[PDB]
Design a protein around this ligand. Structure first.
Ligand SMILES: Nc1ncnc2c1ncn2[C@@H]1O[C@H](COP(=O)(O)OP(=O)(O)O)[C@@H](O)[C@H]1O
Ligand SMILES: Nc1ncnc2c1ncn2[C@@H]1O[C@H](COP(=O)(O)OP(=O)(O)O)[C@@H](O)[C@H]1O
Ligand SMILES: Nc1ncnc2c1ncn2[C@@H]1O[C@H](COP(=O)(O)OP(=O)(O)O)[C@@H](O)[C@H]1O
Ligand SMILES: [Mg+2]
Ligand SMILES: [Mg+2]
Ligand SMILES: [Mg+2]
Lengths: 173, 371, 371, 371
């Protein structure tokens, strides 16, 4: 959503990685209305194999923080979202090879753009919605346990995460 | 520098933010939902608790519980999950460097603020803490020092009469009938038309009905005579699956139990003659200043026509020469919070916190002497 | 290293292959034919069972039996011949070094998967095993985690409603009407024109008729009025012996029993108000996400016009504000296998196998706990 | 002289008779079956509806519908056929000269008794009428005026707490899990052994299974451990065609959903902490007189061992000094009728009927005021 747009590009490794994945997802989102650089189905398959690789690197970066936490009572909200991005990229790898062979065997007339490439957008919207919870669950585990030995070796202060305080709620209406 | 936190943790809703502002930064429901179905996909699981706003988009597979019932915290393990959610996950602050101002209803058990003063110090490690009464904070948000405060929330309602900054503790009345007991009456009253809402995720749908279609009639036994002669009051509401329900005279019979609590089997009096019985327990010299300053706070006091109805009923009880003015601000849902950001950002208040070293000489009984 | 096998042993067709791929390496029919005639030449004989593909090139001297009827394995000595055929003779692997992922319909007998566990461990000696549900694997292969899956195969059709990886087992419906009961209805409906197919080897000819000429009419009572007024719907088919048959209104009367099962004497409702009566047994919050994610799987859902007919019949039952999207992929015959290659090649799945060491401390009743 | 009729028209069974007797004169099932097959013989036809007892001898060619589902009459043309059958064809009376006492569940729609009043006056032309609640008439039949009545029927179960002839309507709880939802759980639970019952005429065979072999375990997690260690719990039942089925631990897993309603997918609590949660909503002075007088009524409360199980589960919730006595009479299936014959034959009751003269100044809305 617009929460990723509120983050700054000069952050640490996880913020600059989750900013690139929302730029790929924004190229597949407007393809449902046809206002993006991806013109036909054959570019959506190349982008879905790209967001499944960048999303497979935050499983690596997210597990360098999950093992440095001292007790097992705080990483339960972090490993629960690291196992969801293990599934959503395995679907994006295999259901892009499947839709490449259907496009190759039956031709280009079998795929229709919209309502045919929606099996890759729906599996990528669920990857992005489970990777902004992986940023937020890793921001908590990096500042709640900052002074412990092991977490400071990653060099992740609270100022490196460029997330601001939220807006004021409306009083009336 | 070191701006204080103000966490007004009522029943039903949690409002938090920074002291000195005019609006809360975090308003989310106070529910902790756990899944009740069987998970088939691997990975979809290992997350056995959803707190706040993410347990209402994902209701329909969860069982929603409230940790605070009737103003009293009943589940002390699900209440720590909400305080952990409103500091790190919602406000994105660190509690080790901000003092927090909590908020409690009057006439509560003394082991309810004796455990709030233990969790904030020994688990969240705040530098300072203070527990304030709800209806004394909704007088700061009106610009008054005198008045009588009807604070109708989700768990309890209470009247606190205050004159010149001096509270009268013998005239503080408290009802346990509030906005949650109007939802559970609306589920029972809607079975007369066929709609049966049962589950804990279906009580959030009938709660969103009463926030949109319910209103207080100015004369109940006249409005019940025009709801039967015609269909001029029936309004339609669309359920989450697309079904359209139609509600007639159940629109004003639901907030009428605040004025006639015999509908739900309670013996006590309505909110119009429990705010008059607490006026008549004050001194005679200050009753003229409480009749004119009648502050209404809380979210349950936001029905369309609850100020025009309540002014009609206290006028019929008070003597005919006293003028009666009911002050209902348009922002009265957040009045308990706005006075919390006024009190915690004061210059005189900064010597009244309960510091962490003061918690070491005493026990958790320090909060009874300083608050 | 040690790539898993994914053997979807459905009725009527066996699809096997390796986990992590995108297409099965082995698709052959699930028949075991035995010769019924008298062998005169010495040498032709001493071979009393043909399995799979060579029992259809050599039919006409064989009687063809199906070991799995209605999703339940009826012949346990002929099912071992198909598993022996699909490992050694068809996939050319050794089962002693590959773990296999079997596949079963919901609401089957518990002694059906208790004997698949006993056979793979005590006869084929696999290192690990797992038995999955069919309609949960056709959501893996569809890019979703929420949705309702109509999986129409050869023995059974079943609906499994799933919301965010959480299944609702009280809303799982199952019909025994499937594709093999449309072959036996086409044999009876073709006798009105004179063509009489009788034998077990003549049922594979009328099965190839319905895969080529049968379709689903969008309006049945209008299509029967234009099938009799003109002859624009008739199409010809050539038998294996050179004869040409002509089929008129039996092209759409054969797949119409999925929507009107009173043609075969069944009392059950169609597949358009079985997929709706299982949505309306789910909770009200998740019904908007099951109307829009309506996955169709299996081979019997491949008639021309079964998606445009089914959108017509749920929009006549669902409320008028819900939008209904039916997801019919072009490769929906192999959807149950592709989600089996997804699940077995998963990084987090590799602790959910039923290992051979686990099979010794329990009996064959371990498959009920772990699956 | 002009002895009144008492028609307890429950879901699943209709009990009728004369007021003042000790037993009903007419007990027949509440089904209206219509033929679904093709009639070939001339004369054997022209009869499109069988009601009551001859729609169970002639089932197997019929489709059996229930006009009352969950205590609410869904089919108003099929319900006129059962009232016409129970007056003329079964009781052999003329309804123009007998006043009838109908019977309704609590917390029903208000247009349910507004159409029983319209049909009994404008079609059957009775001189007088009265509609009573079910669970108050099962206190007349026990010789009590105080107590709490669990009335488990076929559509609904409900608790009505009554102290000295004064009912507490804020503590009346109502479930929709009843005996018909244990038949539909027995159909699903029996597919694990191979037996599949599908049709509406096959749901009456699995209903006769649970009336003969089903019982309530005293300790469920111990009985499930001795049902698997041996075969001392299995009992055989013979189908109408001579086939013998064998049922093991499905004898006590079917009535266990009354105490654990999470089996059939419902969220709400069991019947042991619904009859306790409605005790704890009454006044504290009358709770000692409701723990000792615990009336159990209806047909679903007739499993062998539901009284010894329910005393085990309320004494684990109630305080340790209150003694708990559960009063299950041996004739508790007809308790709602016997109190109907007690009330309608009373000397004081004879001015509380709704006469046909009173029906003319009002509409059908007179039944809400006089009942
Ligand atoms: N606009 C409204 N109209 C009527 N009732 C309302 C409205 N908004 C909220 N309510 C009721 O009042 C409650 C809000 O009270 P609130 O002050 O948020 O409670 P708390 O003291 O627990 O924070 C809602 O849960 C609902 O029952
Ligand atoms: N084009 C088609 N039109 C109609 N039915 C088809 C078509 N192709 C295959 N079928 C049917 O699909 C079934 C086989 O596909 P599948 O669902 O994989 O079978 P199974 O589930 O028994 O393994 C058979 O009943 C066959 O008649
Ligand atoms: N011996 C029994 N054991 C269990 N259930 C029974 C028994 N006898 C009758 N029932 C159940 O009781 C119900 C019918 O009795 P009753 O309570 O009078 O029905 P209703 O309230 O629908 O008129 C059915 O659900 C039936 O299965
Ligand atoms: Mg409040
Ligand atoms: Mg299949
Ligand atoms: Mg009854």
């Amino acid at each position: 959503d617009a929460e990723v747009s509120k983050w700054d590009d000069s952050g640490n490794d996880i913020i600059v990685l989750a900013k690139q994945m929302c730029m790929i997802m924004m190229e597949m989102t407007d393809f449902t209305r046809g206002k993006g650089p991806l013109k036909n189905t054959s570019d959506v398959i190349s982008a879905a194999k790209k967001i499944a690789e960048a999303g497979s690197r935050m499983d690596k970066l997210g597990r360098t923080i999950a093992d440095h936490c001292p007790d097992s009572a705080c990483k339960q909200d972090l490993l629960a979202y690291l196992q969801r991005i293990a599934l959503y990229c395995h679907q994006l790898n295999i259901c892009s090879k499947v839709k490449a062979e259907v496009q190759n065997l039956g031709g280009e007339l079998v795929v229709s753009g919209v309502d045919s490439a929606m099996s890759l957008i729906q599996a990528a919207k669920n990857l992005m919605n489970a990777v902004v919870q992986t940023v937020k669950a890793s921001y908590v585990a990096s500042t709640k346990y900052q002074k412990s030995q092991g977490m400071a070796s990653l060099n992740l202060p609270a100022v490196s995460w460029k997330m601001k305080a939220p807006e004021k709620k409306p009083l009336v209406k | 520098e070191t701006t204080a936190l103000v966490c007004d943790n009522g029943s039903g809703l949690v409002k938090a933010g920074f002291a000195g502002d005019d609006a809360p930064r975090a308003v989310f429901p106070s529910i902790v939902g756990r899944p009740r179905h069987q998970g088939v996909m691997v990975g979809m699981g290992q997350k056995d608790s959803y707190v706040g706003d993410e347990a209402q988009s994902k209701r329909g597979i969860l069982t929603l519980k409230y940790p605070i019932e009737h103003g009293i915290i009943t589940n002390w393990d699900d209440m720590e999950k909400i305080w952990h959610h409103t500091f790190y996950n919602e406000l994105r602050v660190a509690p080790e460097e901000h003092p927090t101002l909590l908020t409690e209803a009057p006439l509560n058990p003394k082991a309810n603020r004796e455990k709030m003063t233990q969790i904030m110090f020994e688990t969240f490690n705040v530098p300072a803490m203070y527990v304030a009464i709800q209806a004394v904070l909704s007088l700061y948000a009106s610009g008054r020092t005198t008045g009588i405060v009807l604070d109708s929330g989700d768990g309890v309602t209470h009247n606190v009469p205050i004159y010149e900054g001096y509270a009268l503790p013998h005239a503080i009345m408290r009802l346990d009938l509030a906005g949650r007991d109007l939802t559970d009456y609306l589920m029972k009253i809607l079975t007369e038309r066929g709609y049966s809402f049962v589950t804990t995720a279906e009580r959030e749908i009938v709660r969103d009905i009463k926030e949109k279609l319910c209103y207080v009639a100015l004369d109940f036994e006249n409005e019940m005579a025009t709801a039967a002669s015609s269909s001029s009051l029936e309004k339609s509401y669309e359920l989450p699956d697309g079904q359209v329900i139609t509600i007639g005279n159940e629109r004003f019979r639901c907030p009428e139990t605040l004025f006639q609590p015999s509908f739900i089997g309670m013996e006590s009096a309505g909110i119009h003659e429990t705010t008059y019985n607490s006026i008549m327990k004050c001194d005679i010299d200050i009753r003229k200043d409480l009749y004119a300053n009648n502050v209404m706070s809380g979210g349950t006091t936001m029905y369309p026509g609850i100020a025009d109805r309540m002014q009609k009923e206290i006028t019929a009880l008070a003597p005919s020469t006293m003028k009666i003015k009911i002050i209902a601000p348009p922002e009265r849902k957040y009045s308990v919070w706005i006075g919390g950001s006024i009190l915690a950002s004061l210059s005189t208040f900064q010597q009244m916190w309960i510091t962490k070293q003061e918690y070491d000489e005493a026990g958790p009984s320090i909060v009874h002497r300083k608050c």
